[PDB]
């Protein structure tokens, strides 16, 4: 007889099902995990990020990475919005382009 | 009772009122303080001493109501 | 509902099983703040002591005289009491 | 299912330890444990 | 259908379902559905947890996010978009507010684009980066950073495909085949029944490059094993296991 | 209840317009409202589940006509509850066998149910009349022997 | 040989058919039951609402 | 609850499917009673400094001959002890 | 937003009473787990005796222990107080 | 983690060691360790 | 680094996932110190002609 | 940063752990050019000699 346990990442979490009726390559619960068809490893964590020192005191609600703009050169920027205003940052300075 | 703060509601007579606002008033606010809108959220400080929670509609007729709190 | 912040302040039967339910939050908050202020220094591991676990809940008395003399070993380090050998050697040498 | 004390001193606890040491315990089974014990004691005293 | 339905509906139906969101993590073939954590204010919209699904192999997994009000893809700052020696003319080795710098960070795109998050903690945050998790505390109103805690969990290992379930099975070893460097924290336990989430019995650390297995001693018929990785300097992986076990009796 | 199980993100419930002068929920905790015409009153009682399978000939293992001594059922349940197992049989294949015994399989204490039969055609039933039970049954494993025939 | 009885919920009630010619994971009658592909449990009852 | 199993070792986990929230006051009063029983005479535990707890957890086994740390000092006089309090008697009287 | 995750240290104002009802038995279970973990051995910790910590507030300063003037005439063996047998033995030997 | 001492010299430590070498920690089994030790001592002294 | 394993047998390979580039000066100063220790008294090694090296490598074992 | 081209020319501690990072390239280039000019003839195999590997580091004396 043989009892191998391979392809730990072929299938991930299977809840809502009798744990005593699943396959050995399954889990009843998981968090911060990443599977590619044969393997399991810790998921990449988090970390802060600041184009400028002025954005670290801002609560953004949404944004989009605009790649080009007539005034801007061949460099991308961001169009981020807040509770009251819309801001733009391009790794050099912050500007409020909210409609006046 | 001590610390407990029960929320009171004030339903205006008309179903709607534009530009409406309420500024709740209570003589000697040192016993309690309330303000905002129809939602009062009366706070209690002492364990005794009655109070007279009366409304003050900013707009509309100055006519208001009166309620008698009973801490005991 | 009591307005105290410490232990032994409110009768567990004060809810009466008839009080309004909106006071449950104020009771849980009171209990939590009491547990926090009665042991504000508990931040290291649980550090279970249970008062020696056996008898010290009643024998640990200090009213007019102390008891439970320590049974420490020799204090060759941090010279304290007059260990017998040292004092004997000093006396015989003079 | 049933419980029992360390020493099996009497018939009352033996008839329960029997059902314990054999998970085959139920109504139709416990009622005949006396008969099994009778047969066992007969087989014992026949030559002991 | 019958894998995570009762879990997602339960976890999202508690605090704020309307805050649920999605994002196409094409960088790694993953589409997660952001939603608010279980314990949070009913007036909060900062998604805390996420259920990530891989559309290439049809597998479900969960994770945590740093209170994302929004999400999107964008290029990183100049210091992370590929810097140059002759650019740090004002920077020095005294890490002037910048320490999380690496020579060559793993990339998921040719243009080296990074997924950024608009966090509720007054600032932006990267979602998929080195092991670090920023958990917020309401007591002192301060942000706290701690290692990223992974947890795998499978219960009810009856070995029905090998031997009988009710039969007791003495567990001795797990012989995994890992890859990379790291330091896991294995946990194991069991229960004499099938319905209960067994209680733990031991725990061992499987540091790679030194140990070739983990030694645990159990004889409960229904085994369960958990895997934890709380280290910051670990990038290991687990391809498969091989449990050594015997068979006792029953009743 | 503090947190009732949900089947939707918006937490919507299926309601019924009942003949008993009021509304009623259809999928909720164990409770069944059975109406009685005698006293013209509504009556609430636990929800009674019943599973039933007859004619278990074991043809896929041994011969049908052969008598088979039944001893145990070794289920693999999930959750908490208290079932009421029933079992029986008959010397034939056409008749719905008569019961022979009945046992309660409380989860967390018992690991099986002990029944004694030797009829060749077995049938087992499962009943759950408890109000505080949310158990489940994934599968069984019957222990049996083989006697003779005729 | 082996005699497992698994996936009790893969198939539910099968009546109008020879009960001595079905699978072990079937039933000749059921009520207030709920199956999801591997399991069986009591169906949620009823209750008033106002 | 189920029976009089009441003891200062509680059972947090609940069935979680039906709890009858109106019984919450029962749990709150039970918690209050247990907390008052475990610590009958207590007002405000402070001054522990969360330092003696560790020494007590490591220096356990206060049964006759224990190992303890405390006022380990030069220990010259310690009223009611030796350390050059009886030698001088023999020296002078002789 | 889920605030029902706390261990060894709680927060009274996090419940934010104007919140859903899931906050409840969850917080009760959390409190029970915290109490059990902090001290998972409790029979009758009455080692206070009507707030003795106030007068016995000497636990943090183990350098100047009370050391009542009483002779503490309870000693089995110590490297301190010595017997006069050395005097008699020394006199006999020389 | 039932922990026994190196110099096994008593009945309690022997019971704990028996429950250890049989890793199963369940009341159905632990409550009968006394009966097993009774049977063992009655088997040894009967002809020793 | 990890510990005082410092010796004139270095460890080029790094984890390569996180290196904290600000520590590069530490590696540079370590390399400088090791190179100064291995050859304390040296100004400009020349004139070897890269010919005596081979004879010395083949004619080893200068022991008696 | 030194302007020398040979060994034993710059204190390994000269970076101070406070100098600007833009000097790292100039340090690596300096180190490489020093290693190149101090052994310009090393082109054949490594030709390990290690000074007899045993004792010749001190016994190899020629004064009078």
Author numbering:
A (entry chain G): 2 to 101
B (entry chain G): 303 to 374
C (entry chain C), H (entry chain H), I (entry chain I): 4 to 97
D (entry chain B), J (entry chain A): 3 to 50
E (entry chain G): 755 to 1005
F (entry chain G): 856 to 1005
G (entry chain G): 2 to 51
K (entry chain H), L (entry chain C): 4 to 67
Quote from the publication:
Escherichia coli phage SU10 belongs to the genus Kuravirus from the class Caudoviricetes of phages with short non-contractile tails. Here we show that the virion of SU10 has a prolate head, containing genome and ejection proteins, and a tail, which is formed of portal, adaptor, nozzle, and tail needle proteins and decorated with long and short fibers. In contrast to other short-tailed phages, the tails of Kuraviruses elongate upon cell attachment. After binding to the host, SU10 tail, nozzle proteins, and short fibers re-arrange to form a nozzle that extends the tail.
The dodecamer of SU10 adaptor proteins forms the interface between the dodecamer of portal proteins and hexamer of nozzle proteins. Six long tail fibers are attached to the sides of the adaptor complex. The coiled-coiled part of each long tail fiber is held by fiber dock loops from two neighboring adaptor proteins. The hexamer of nozzle proteins, attached to the adaptor, is decorated with six short tail fibers, and its central channel is plugged with a tail needle. In the SU10 virion, the Ig-like nozzle domains are organized into an L-shape arrangement. The first two nozzle domains form a blunt tip of the tail, then there is an 82° turn and the remaining two domains point towards the capsid. Nozzle domain 4 interacts with the short tail fiber dock loop from the nozzle protein located counterclockwise. The short tail fiber is attached to a fiber dock loop from a nozzle protein. The fiber dock loop contains tryptophans 839, 847, and 857, the side chains of which are arranged in a pseudo-threefold symmetry. The position of the short tail fiber is additionally stabilized by the interaction of the central domain of the short tail fiber with residues 71–78 of the long tail fiber.
